[PDB]
Amino acid sequence: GFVKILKEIVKLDNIVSSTWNPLDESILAYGEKNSVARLARIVETYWKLTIIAELRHPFALSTNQVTCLAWSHDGNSIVTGVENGELRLWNKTGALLNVLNFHRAPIVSVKWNKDGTHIISMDVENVTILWNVISGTVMQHFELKGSLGVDVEWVDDDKFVIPGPKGAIFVYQITEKTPTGKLIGHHGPISVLEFNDTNKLLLSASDDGTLRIWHGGNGNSQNCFYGHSQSIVSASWVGDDKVISCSMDGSVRLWSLKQNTLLALSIVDGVPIFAGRISQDGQKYAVAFMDGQVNVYDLKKLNSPLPIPLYASYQSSQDNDYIFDLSWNCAGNKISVAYSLQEGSVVAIPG
């Protein structure tokens, strides 16, 4: 009955991607193309943007854009990865803590474990590394191999999953090189791996157009959701009984585990979605369409063939640039939009 039109509150330089601090609603980390990322604070007085620190990566002895950023769960540390494969660890104030260099290809995913002592990193060539992030040492290295997928995930304080051949998902324990199990079901590269630490279920998405929910540490999946007609680009848990996904088919779909069925969906026919992100409170889902428009969907009533209510939209006819990434601040009142070429934008999300 009313769609909000979002406004920009802060203009950024061009950014490749960004991620807000998990515990401080005012701190944003963003990667840039010139082998550098920055930590910034955004506070209202209007809105003021202040750079906290520069997180620079040297060019290799031999383009080197920052391709990945990941805050620790406690929000005190952050890992940045660049095109040449190097990873650097920093404190939230900017101090360099450690240099973790082993990958030789662009970093695509970095996941921190529960207590902030280990991370799993994976590059475009699917080389996956388990690091003791404090000592900066390589504990395990995996080369299971086109792309096998672009995500990895921790499923316990000492257990994790990574994409394997032919759509399989391999399960590992920190102290063992041999997989403890294999999750077989997908028929294409793994695009998303999200573990829910409350219901203890793993959500996976694949280029095969399906989502799977896994309970067992080996074997078949608990749920398999068909519906998307093209690759799934993003997927998230919505509480403990639902999952939401978006795809290149231009649709956003909310699924029910309790009823094993599609609960609701919204679509912009012919307009692919490049990325989707769930808010901290799990009540809003923001997606970036190929046409440069950002739609924020409201899941509130659905959580209290149905359509997913459109809460707000961000767009303008002054440029036709693509949006490659978006991120929510922890309070859910700001979203950082990363355009492919033009300046980034921080937009306010009304409550």
XYZ file of N, CA, C and O in Angstrom, residues 172-278:
428
model
N 34.603 -31.457 6.558
C 35.898 -31.688 7.191
C 35.942 -31.308 8.661
O 35.119 -30.537 9.152
N 36.942 -31.853 9.345
C 37.196 -31.553 10.743
C 38.604 -30.961 10.691
O 39.435 -31.415 9.908
N 38.864 -29.945 11.504
C 40.162 -29.274 11.508
C 41.408 -30.156 11.569
O 42.386 -29.891 10.870
N 41.378 -31.201 12.390
C 42.541 -32.073 12.545
C 42.703 -33.195 11.522
O 43.683 -33.940 11.580
N 41.768 -33.324 10.585
C 41.863 -34.390 9.591
C 41.824 -33.912 8.145
O 40.993 -33.086 7.776
N 42.724 -34.454 7.329
C 42.802 -34.094 5.918
C 41.741 -34.828 5.105
O 41.302 -34.346 4.060
N 41.335 -35.996 5.592
C 40.321 -36.798 4.916
C 38.925 -36.323 5.312
O 38.632 -36.158 6.495
N 38.045 -36.093 4.324
C 36.682 -35.638 4.616
C 35.976 -36.580 5.588
O 36.123 -37.799 5.492
N 35.220 -36.014 6.522
C 34.480 -36.820 7.488
C 33.171 -37.273 6.849
O 32.506 -38.187 7.341
N 32.809 -36.622 5.750
C 31.584 -36.964 5.052
C 31.432 -36.193 3.755
O 32.184 -35.257 3.482
N 30.461 -36.597 2.947
C 30.206 -35.937 1.678
C 28.703 -35.790 1.484
O 27.946 -36.753 1.628
N 28.279 -34.568 1.181
C 26.874 -34.266 0.962
C 26.641 -34.289 -0.546
O 27.075 -33.391 -1.267
N 25.967 -35.336 -1.012
C 25.703 -35.511 -2.435
C 24.263 -35.178 -2.803
O 23.327 -35.631 -2.147
N 24.098 -34.388 -3.857
C 22.763 -34.010 -4.290
C 22.743 -32.987 -5.410
O 22.020 -33.152 -6.391
N 23.528 -31.923 -5.276
C 23.569 -30.888 -6.306
C 24.203 -31.373 -7.606
O 25.054 -32.266 -7.596
N 23.784 -30.778 -8.720
C 24.305 -31.154 -10.032
C 25.083 -30.018 -10.687
O 25.346 -30.051 -11.890
N 25.449 -29.012 -9.902
C 26.193 -27.893 -10.446
C 27.010 -27.207 -9.369
O 26.882 -27.553 -8.196
N 27.858 -26.232 -9.733
C 28.689 -25.512 -8.763
C 27.898 -24.981 -7.568
O 26.730 -24.605 -7.694
N 28.550 -24.954 -6.410
C 27.932 -24.485 -5.176
C 28.128 -22.977 -5.043
O 29.255 -22.494 -4.938
N 27.022 -22.241 -5.040
C 27.062 -20.782 -4.965
C 26.878 -20.212 -3.563
O 27.295 -19.085 -3.290
N 26.258 -20.986 -2.679
C 26.000 -20.521 -1.321
C 26.075 -21.647 -0.300
O 25.588 -22.746 -0.544
N 26.682 -21.351 0.845
C 26.766 -22.293 1.958
C 26.558 -21.456 3.217
O 27.383 -20.605 3.552
N 25.433 -21.690 3.887
C 25.068 -20.962 5.099
C 24.582 -21.906 6.188
O 23.561 -22.584 6.032
N 25.310 -21.942 7.298
C 24.944 -22.803 8.412
C 24.169 -22.023 9.467
O 24.530 -20.896 9.811
N 23.099 -22.631 9.967
C 22.263 -22.033 11.004
C 22.675 -22.737 12.301
O 22.423 -23.928 12.481
N 23.321 -21.993 13.194
C 23.817 -22.560 14.443
C 22.752 -22.872 15.486
O 23.060 -23.446 16.532
N 21.506 -22.499 15.215
C 20.427 -22.789 16.153
C 19.748 -24.107 15.799
O 19.619 -24.983 16.654
N 19.314 -24.258 14.549
C 18.667 -25.501 14.142
C 19.678 -26.536 13.638
O 19.315 -27.667 13.317
N 20.948 -26.138 13.582
C 22.041 -27.006 13.143
C 21.886 -27.556 11.729
O 22.281 -28.687 11.439
N 21.309 -26.751 10.845
C 21.120 -27.167 9.464
C 21.956 -26.316 8.525
O 22.184 -25.134 8.776
N 22.412 -26.937 7.443
C 23.204 -26.255 6.432
C 22.335 -25.970 5.219
O 21.643 -26.858 4.723
N 22.364 -24.724 4.758
C 21.625 -24.321 3.569
C 22.643 -24.207 2.442
O 23.695 -23.590 2.615
N 22.354 -24.824 1.300
C 23.249 -24.717 0.155
C 22.444 -24.286 -1.067
O 21.249 -24.567 -1.164
N 23.092 -23.561 -1.972
C 22.450 -23.128 -3.210
C 23.415 -23.511 -4.317
O 24.631 -23.564 -4.101
N 22.884 -23.770 -5.504
C 23.726 -24.194 -6.612
C 23.335 -23.587 -7.951
O 22.236 -23.050 -8.113
N 24.256 -23.669 -8.906
C 24.001 -23.175 -10.249
C 22.897 -24.042 -10.842
O 22.268 -23.657 -11.831
N 22.661 -25.208 -10.239
C 21.630 -26.114 -10.737
C 20.216 -25.607 -10.483
O 19.240 -26.284 -10.809
N 20.116 -24.407 -9.917
C 18.822 -23.800 -9.664
C 18.048 -24.285 -8.454
O 16.864 -23.978 -8.315
N 18.705 -25.026 -7.569
C 18.019 -25.529 -6.388
C 18.704 -25.160 -5.087
O 19.881 -24.793 -5.061
N 17.931 -25.256 -4.014
C 18.431 -25.040 -2.668
C 18.297 -26.390 -1.996
O 17.350 -27.129 -2.264
N 19.249 -26.724 -1.140
C 19.157 -27.962 -0.385
C 19.416 -27.630 1.079
O 20.138 -26.678 1.397
N 18.782 -28.392 1.963
C 18.930 -28.219 3.406
C 19.530 -29.530 3.892
O 19.003 -30.604 3.590
N 20.629 -29.455 4.637
C 21.294 -30.668 5.112
C 21.337 -30.800 6.622
O 21.662 -29.846 7.336
N 21.019 -32.000 7.096
C 21.040 -32.314 8.519
C 22.152 -33.314 8.818
O 22.903 -33.149 9.779
N 22.239 -34.354 7.994
C 23.248 -35.383 8.184
C 24.646 -34.932 7.820
O 24.823 -34.059 6.972
N 25.644 -35.528 8.463
C 27.023 -35.164 8.183
C 27.545 -35.925 6.983
O 28.711 -35.805 6.602
N 26.668 -36.714 6.380
C 27.016 -37.511 5.217
C 25.735 -38.078 4.615
O 24.806 -38.428 5.339
N 25.675 -38.142 3.292
C 24.490 -38.680 2.650
C 23.631 -37.670 1.912
O 24.132 -36.672 1.388
N 22.328 -37.935 1.882
C 21.361 -37.087 1.187
C 20.885 -35.888 1.997
O 21.114 -35.804 3.203
N 20.207 -34.966 1.320
C 19.695 -33.771 1.973
C 18.320 -33.988 2.596
O 17.615 -34.949 2.271
N 17.958 -33.088 3.502
C 16.678 -33.122 4.197
C 15.589 -32.477 3.341
O 14.448 -32.938 3.318
N 15.950 -31.399 2.651
C 15.022 -30.699 1.765
C 15.735 -30.343 0.472
O 16.955 -30.187 0.448
N 14.963 -30.225 -0.603
C 15.491 -29.821 -1.900
C 14.377 -28.999 -2.527
O 13.294 -29.520 -2.803
N 14.640 -27.713 -2.732
C 13.647 -26.808 -3.296
C 13.874 -26.440 -4.761
O 14.871 -25.792 -5.109
N 12.932 -26.860 -5.604
C 12.952 -26.575 -7.037
C 12.031 -25.391 -7.305
O 11.040 -25.195 -6.604
N 12.352 -24.616 -8.331
C 11.520 -23.475 -8.667
C 12.258 -22.456 -9.505
O 11.749 -21.992 -10.530
N 13.457 -22.089 -9.067
C 14.254 -21.125 -9.808
C 14.586 -21.704 -11.179
O 14.904 -22.887 -11.300
N 14.499 -20.869 -12.209
C 14.769 -21.310 -13.572
C 16.193 -21.016 -14.024
O 16.597 -21.398 -15.123
N 16.950 -20.327 -13.177
C 18.336 -20.004 -13.485
C 19.152 -20.088 -12.200
O 18.601 -20.301 -11.120
N 20.463 -19.919 -12.326
C 21.368 -19.992 -11.187
C 20.944 -19.122 -10.013
O 20.470 -17.998 -10.190
N 21.119 -19.655 -8.809
C 20.792 -18.924 -7.595
C 22.043 -18.148 -7.196
O 23.111 -18.732 -6.999
N 21.913 -16.832 -7.075
C 23.055 -15.991 -6.739
C 23.276 -15.772 -5.249
O 24.412 -15.595 -4.811
N 22.199 -15.792 -4.468
C 22.306 -15.595 -3.025
C 21.170 -16.320 -2.317
O 20.101 -16.518 -2.891
N 21.409 -16.714 -1.070
C 20.397 -17.379 -0.256
C 20.748 -17.187 1.211
O 21.925 -17.153 1.579
N 19.722 -17.061 2.045
C 19.912 -16.847 3.474
C 18.838 -17.524 4.299
O 17.744 -17.821 3.815
N 19.160 -17.748 5.566
C 18.201 -18.301 6.493
C 17.316 -17.141 6.918
O 17.777 -16.002 7.027
N 16.040 -17.433 7.129
C 15.088 -16.439 7.605
C 14.561 -17.127 8.854
O 13.618 -17.918 8.802
N 15.196 -16.841 9.983
C 14.796 -17.506 11.206
C 15.293 -18.938 11.115
O 16.299 -19.216 10.452
N 14.575 -19.858 11.748
C 14.970 -21.260 11.755
C 14.089 -22.171 10.908
O 14.437 -23.330 10.693
N 12.962 -21.658 10.427
C 12.033 -22.482 9.656
C 11.857 -22.079 8.200
O 11.051 -22.676 7.490
N 12.600 -21.074 7.751
C 12.479 -20.617 6.372
C 13.827 -20.212 5.795
O 14.766 -19.925 6.533
N 13.910 -20.208 4.469
C 15.106 -19.765 3.764
C 14.611 -18.921 2.600
O 13.482 -19.087 2.136
N 15.443 -17.989 2.156
C 15.072 -17.114 1.057
C 16.205 -17.113 0.045
O 17.379 -17.203 0.408
N 15.845 -17.037 -1.229
C 16.837 -17.049 -2.290
C 16.476 -16.088 -3.409
O 15.319 -15.700 -3.556
N 17.480 -15.682 -4.177
C 17.238 -14.828 -5.332
C 18.083 -15.391 -6.464
O 19.104 -16.054 -6.237
N 17.662 -15.125 -7.692
C 18.318 -15.729 -8.833
C 18.456 -14.859 -10.067
O 17.898 -13.764 -10.150
N 19.222 -15.366 -11.025
C 19.413 -14.667 -12.281
C 18.086 -14.661 -13.036
O 17.938 -13.949 -14.029
N 17.118 -15.448 -12.564
C 15.809 -15.484 -13.209
C 14.953 -14.291 -12.788
O 13.791 -14.177 -13.184
N 15.537 -13.406 -11.982
C 14.834 -12.214 -11.538
C 13.830 -12.371 -10.411
O 13.086 -11.435 -10.111
N 13.810 -13.533 -9.766
C 12.859 -13.758 -8.684
C 13.482 -13.918 -7.308
O 14.652 -14.281 -7.168
N 12.673 -13.619 -6.300
C 13.045 -13.755 -4.902
C 12.024 -14.757 -4.388
O 10.818 -14.565 -4.562
N 12.499 -15.836 -3.775
C 11.598 -16.862 -3.279
C 11.830 -17.197 -1.817
O 12.966 -17.401 -1.389
N 10.737 -17.233 -1.060
C 10.772 -17.555 0.366
C 10.213 -18.967 0.498
O 9.099 -19.250 0.040
N 10.986 -19.843 1.130
C 10.610 -21.245 1.276
C 10.352 -21.653 2.720
O 11.019 -21.177 3.633
N 9.389 -22.552 2.910
C 9.035 -23.053 4.235
C 9.556 -24.469 4.455
O 9.252 -25.377 3.681
N 10.351 -24.665 5.503
C 10.855 -26.000 5.804
C 9.753 -26.832 6.460
O 9.640 -28.030 6.209
N 8.930 -26.187 7.283
C 7.852 -26.885 7.977
C 6.794 -27.437 7.033
O 6.234 -28.502 7.285
N 6.530 -26.723 5.942
C 5.520 -27.157 4.981
C 6.113 -27.686 3.677
O 5.373 -28.123 2.791
N 7.439 -27.650 3.564
C 8.134 -28.109 2.362
C 7.503 -27.511 1.110
O 7.070 -28.230 0.207
N 7.465 -26.187 1.045
C 6.851 -25.550 -0.105
C 7.242 -24.087 -0.229
O 7.757 -23.482 0.715
N 7.002 -23.532 -1.412
C 7.271 -22.132 -1.681
C 6.201 -21.355 -0.922
O 5.004 -21.574 -1.125
N 6.623 -20.457 -0.041
C 5.688 -19.671 0.748
C 5.275 -18.377 0.052
O 4.114 -17.970 0.115
N 6.231 -17.731 -0.609
C 5.955 -16.480 -1.296
C 7.036 -16.172 -2.319
O 8.143 -16.699 -2.242
N 6.714 -15.315 -3.282
C 7.692 -14.948 -4.290
C 7.363 -13.617 -4.939
O 6.205 -13.193 -4.979
N 8.405 -12.961 -5.431
C 8.272 -11.686 -6.121
C 9.240 -11.745 -7.285
O 10.320 -12.325 -7.171
N 8.861 -11.151 -8.409
C 9.719 -11.194 -9.578
C 9.619 -9.967 -10.468
O 8.572 -9.327 -10.559
N 10.736 -9.650 -11.111
C 10.816 -8.549 -12.058
C 11.235 -9.266 -13.333
O 12.423 -9.406 -13.624
N 10.240 -9.747 -14.070
C 10.463 -10.495 -15.300
C 11.527 -9.914 -16.224
O 11.498 -8.731 -16.565
N 12.468 -10.766 -16.616
C 13.529 -10.355 -17.518
C 14.673 -9.568 -16.909
O 15.630 -9.242 -17.611
N 14.592 -9.257 -15.619
C 15.655 -8.499 -14.969
C 16.355 -9.336 -13.903
O 15.847 -9.508 -12.796
N 17.539 -9.868 -14.232
C 18.329 -10.695 -13.316
C 18.709 -9.988 -12.021
O 18.872 -8.767 -11.983
N 18.838 -10.769 -10.956
C 19.259 -10.239 -9.671
C 20.711 -10.677 -9.521
O 21.038 -11.845 -9.753
N 21.578 -9.737 -9.156
C 23.000 -10.026 -8.998
C 23.416 -10.356 -7.572
O 24.439 -11.006 -7.355
N 22.636 -9.903 -6.598
C 22.961 -10.170 -5.202
C 21.777 -9.899 -4.291
O 20.942 -9.048 -4.584
N 21.717 -10.645 -3.191
C 20.652 -10.491 -2.215
C 21.251 -10.597 -0.825
O 22.161 -11.403 -0.604
N 20.756 -9.791 0.110
C 21.267 -9.792 1.482
C 20.139 -9.673 2.492
O 19.255 -8.828 2.348
N 20.177 -10.509 3.523
C 19.155 -10.460 4.561
C 19.633 -9.520 5.666
O 20.829 -9.452 5.967
